[PDB]
Structure 1
Amino acid sequence: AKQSLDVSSDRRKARKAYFTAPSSQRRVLLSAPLSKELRAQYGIKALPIRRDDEVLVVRGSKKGQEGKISSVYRLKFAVQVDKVTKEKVNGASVPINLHPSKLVITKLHLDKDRKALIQRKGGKL
């Protein structure tokens, strides 16, 4: 239940806020959960997603298939996983737009600020 007077439970305001969100807010909105192995190691449930990290697809037609994220399409609220590709009729390859809630991270890409992000959220690298 809503207790605060600051937050709004309006549908119209909430849908607008989401669809007209900037790239920085869309980084947080495109968060993926970690697999049970990484959750056991790092002691953290979910993180925002980036490029050079591996992933396993849980839900959809491409069920159980895995790979490494090529590009976070923040405009379309999507990731494009390499080797998870729909072959066009002309022989060309087009990547499927997956959503990061349906994905699960298997192997993170640890940078300096990424290490700091884990340490902030109560982690142990």
Structure 2
Amino acid sequence: AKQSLDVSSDRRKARKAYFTAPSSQRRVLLSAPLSKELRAQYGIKALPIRRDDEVLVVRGSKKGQEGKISSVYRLKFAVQVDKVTKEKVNGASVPINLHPSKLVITKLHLDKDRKALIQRKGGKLE
């Protein structure tokens, strides 16, 4: 159980922290797990989602599908994969808000900073 006196077990405060988090605090909340493919590759488990990652849906009605994130939507705690969508009655298509804890990242989008991210965390990266 908890030891430190600086951290809270209060359910009211946890749910207050979560729903009130600013954007830069939510980026860490939206971490998604890497595949059995990549975690032997990059030696790392999860990463904060980014807009261009390629991803596979491992839970829900959309299970088994895959695509590339269109927009990471941080008000809704949602990520929008294109190739996962639902069509309205009048033909306009609408995206399916997914929660990245239910996804798996197949291919990363690497920058200097993203390379630096995997640096700190114990990776190797080719």
- TM-score when normalising by structure 1: 0.99
SS in 2 for 1:101: helix
Structure 2 CA distance for aligned equivalents of residues 51 and 101 of structure 1 = 15
Q: What percentage of residue pairs aligned between the two structures are identical?
A: 100
Give the drift of 1:52: 1.1
Give the drift of 1:4: 0.2
Runs of 5+ in structure 1 lacking a partner?
A: none
| RMSD across aligned positions (CA) | 0.4
Structure 1 CA distance for aligned equivalents of residues 110 and 102 of structure 2 = 22
Give the drift of 1:83: 1.2
Give the drift of 1:73: 0.3
Give the drift of 1:60: 0.6
CA displacement 1:76-114 (0-9 Å, x = unmatched):
000000110000001011000000000000000011100
Paired residues in the alignment total: 125
Structure 2 CA distance for aligned equivalents of residues 123 and 75 of structure 1 = 30
- TM-score when normalising by structure 2: 0.98
Structure 1 CA distance for aligned equivalents of residues 31 and 118 of structure 2 = 14
